[PDB]
Design an enzyme around this catalytic site. Structure first.
Site, short mmCIF file in Angstrom:
data_model
loop_
_atom_site.label_atom_id
_atom_site.label_comp_id
_atom_site.label_asym_id
_atom_site.label_seq_id
_atom_site.Cartn_x
_atom_site.Cartn_y
_atom_site.Cartn_z
N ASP A 1 25.64 -82.01 87.80
CA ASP A 1 24.58 -81.28 87.00
C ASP A 1 24.94 -80.94 85.62
OD1 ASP A 1 22.18 -80.72 86.18
OD2 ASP A 1 21.90 -79.17 87.63
N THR A 2 25.17 -81.65 84.74
CA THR A 2 25.47 -81.02 83.14
C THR A 2 24.39 -80.23 82.88
OG1 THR A 2 24.79 -83.15 82.20
CG2 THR A 2 27.10 -83.24 82.89
N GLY A 3 23.41 -80.29 82.95
CA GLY A 3 22.17 -79.43 82.70
C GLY A 3 22.24 -78.04 83.07
C1 LIG Z 1 14.74 -84.32 89.26
O1 LIG Z 1 15.04 -84.08 87.80
C2 LIG Z 1 15.03 -82.77 87.77
O2 LIG Z 1 14.83 -81.75 88.54
N1 LIG Z 1 15.18 -82.36 86.23
C3 LIG Z 1 14.75 -81.06 85.82
C4 LIG Z 1 15.73 -79.90 86.06
O3 LIG Z 1 15.24 -78.90 86.38
N2 LIG Z 1 17.08 -80.36 86.54
C5 LIG Z 1 18.14 -79.32 86.87
C6 LIG Z 1 18.86 -79.81 88.20
C7 LIG Z 1 17.94 -79.81 89.36
C8 LIG Z 1 17.25 -78.60 89.75
C9 LIG Z 1 16.11 -78.65 91.11
C10 LIG Z 1 16.18 -79.92 91.84
C11 LIG Z 1 17.02 -81.45 91.54
C12 LIG Z 1 17.86 -81.18 90.11
C13 LIG Z 1 19.17 -79.25 85.69
O4 LIG Z 1 19.67 -80.49 85.75
C14 LIG Z 1 18.30 -78.94 84.45
C15 LIG Z 1 18.06 -77.53 84.43
C16 LIG Z 1 17.74 -77.36 82.83
C17 LIG Z 1 17.14 -75.81 82.46
C18 LIG Z 1 18.35 -75.29 81.47
C19 LIG Z 1 18.00 -73.67 81.13
C20 LIG Z 1 16.63 -72.82 81.79
C21 LIG Z 1 15.89 -73.66 82.72
C22 LIG Z 1 15.90 -75.14 83.15
N3 LIG Z 1 19.13 -76.65 84.36
C23 LIG Z 1 19.03 -75.46 85.68
O5 LIG Z 1 17.94 -75.46 86.37
O6 LIG Z 1 20.26 -74.84 85.83
C24 LIG Z 1 20.37 -73.38 86.51
C25 LIG Z 1 21.34 -73.57 87.20
O7 LIG Z 1 22.38 -72.97 86.14
C26 LIG Z 1 21.56 -72.16 85.16
O8 LIG Z 1 21.86 -73.06 83.75
C27 LIG Z 1 20.61 -73.22 83.24
C28 LIG Z 1 19.56 -72.83 83.95
C29 LIG Z 1 20.43 -72.37 85.37
C30 LIG Z 1 13.15 -80.61 86.17
C31 LIG Z 1 12.51 -81.11 85.13
C32 LIG Z 1 13.65 -81.24 83.90
C33 LIG Z 1 14.72 -80.81 84.33
#
Ligand SMILES: COC(=O)NC1(C(=O)N[C@@H](Cc2ccccc2)[C@@H](O)C[C@H](Cc2ccccc2)NC(=O)O[C@H]2CO[C@H]3OCC[C@H]32)CCCC1
Lengths: 99, 99
Positions: free
Chosen positions: B25-27
């Site tokens: 998960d690069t996000g």
């Molecule tokens: C099915 O596709 C999706 O679920 N995609 C969405 C999504 O949430 N994906 C998640 C992965 C994920 C989560 C739950 C079930 C399956 C996959 C991340 O890939 C992206 C988020 C972005 C973000 C950055 C900053 C603040 C809030 C949000 N990262 C995130 O929550 O990271 C946490 C953990 O590390 C911390 O850094 C960043 C925040 C902390 C749902 C809709 C669009 C994106």
């Protein structure tokens, strides 16, 4: 190009005639952009993440240019804190994870 | 290896001697795993994603093997819907985005 992951992989995108910064997210099924006023029809949708769900508007066959690479697909718009480029468009620009 | 994104980039991980499936998960800044029992001390923490915040247990300096590559870093354990490998461990295994 190649993007390291020391920092958030933020890049410039062009959508609906506007330049924005967006996160290349291999963990996102869909592309989700911060609230913006795109023309045309849309359909309501709810997408889930860590913590719960948000309501978004689904726009279809939207053009986005990502670092000069064009992609056309579905774009969701809603109260996201960050613009997110998801796999539906990352596949179209030939993006891979490599280690 | 090189991983395309037509499907979710799920891989097998080993943590605490137990195998699990997790999402590259690069996000995500951080790594968040579903509720499990891990050895060692932990501290309570909260992390926010799309939908809101969740309470997690922070384990530091935890051994975790990701697709044959070893990492030792911070793991958050809590009610996440999916096991996600964030950038704190993706950098350790030498992961980059390429297009
Ligand atoms: C099915 O596709 C999706 O679920 N995609 C969405 C999504 O949430 N994906 C998640 C992965 C994920 C989560 C739950 C079930 C399956 C996959 C991340 O890939 C992206 C988020 C972005 C973000 C950055 C900053 C603040 C809030 C949000 N990262 C995130 O929550 O990271 C946490 C953990 O590390 C911390 O850094 C960043 C925040 C902390 C749902 C809709 C669009 C994106």
């Amino acid at each position: 190009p190649q993007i390291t992951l020391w920092k958030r992989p933020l890049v410039t995108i062009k959508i609906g005639g506007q330049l924005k910064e967006a996160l290349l997210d291999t963990g996102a099924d869909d592309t989700v952009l911060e609230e913006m006023n795109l023309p045309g029809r849309w359909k309501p949708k709810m997408i889930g993440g860590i913590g719960g769900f948000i309501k978004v508007r689904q726009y279809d066959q939207i053009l986005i240019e990502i670092c000069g690479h064009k992609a056309i697909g579905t774009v969701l718009v809603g109260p996201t804190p960050v613009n997110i480029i998801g796999r539906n468009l990352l596949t179209q620009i030939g993006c891979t994870l490599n280690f």
